[PDB]
Each structure stands twice: as C-alpha cells, then as structure tokens.
Amino acid sequence: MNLSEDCSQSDILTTQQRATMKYNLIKLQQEMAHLEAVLEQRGNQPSGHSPSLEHHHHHH
C-alpha cells in the first residue's frame, strides 16, 4: 500500500525457515497439549519427563 509495495513474498522467511518454524511450533504445541494432559490427569506417572534442565532455583 503506497509506502510498502512488495516484492518476492514467497521466499522472504526462507523455505528453510518455513520447514523450521513448522517443526518448531509442532514439537512446542504437541508437548504443550499432550505432556500437560499426561501430567494433570495421570500425575506425570506414565511419562516421567525430567529432561536435564533441573536448574529450577529462585532462593536457596
């Protein structure tokens, strides 16, 4: 629109960054809904996901 005439809108966020942002938001949303569901309903009992980031401190 006047000031912003464009361009090459197909590849701007690159085709690599397209597949990237998909598989990123996919793992983030699957772990969101599924890991929470398993945690609040079944108490994180059948999963038991302690990854490695156990650096959960605030005041020792």
Partner 1 sequence: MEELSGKPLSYAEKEKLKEKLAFLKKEYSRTLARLQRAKRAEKAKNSKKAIEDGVPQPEALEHHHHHH
Q: Interface with partner 1 includes 37 (CB under 8 A)?
A: no
Per-residue tokens: 50: 């302690």
Q: Interface with partner 1 includes 12 (CB under 8 A)?
A: yes
Q: Interface with partner 1 includes 6 (CB under 8 A)?
A: yes
What SS3 class is residue 46?
coil
The CA–CA distances, whole Å, from 19 to 8, 26, 40, 48, 49 equal 18, 10, 31, 30, 26
Q: Which residues bind partner 1 (CB under 8 A)?
A: 3-9, 11-17, 20-21, 24-25, 28-29, 31-32, 35-36, 39-40, 43-44, 49-51, 53, 56
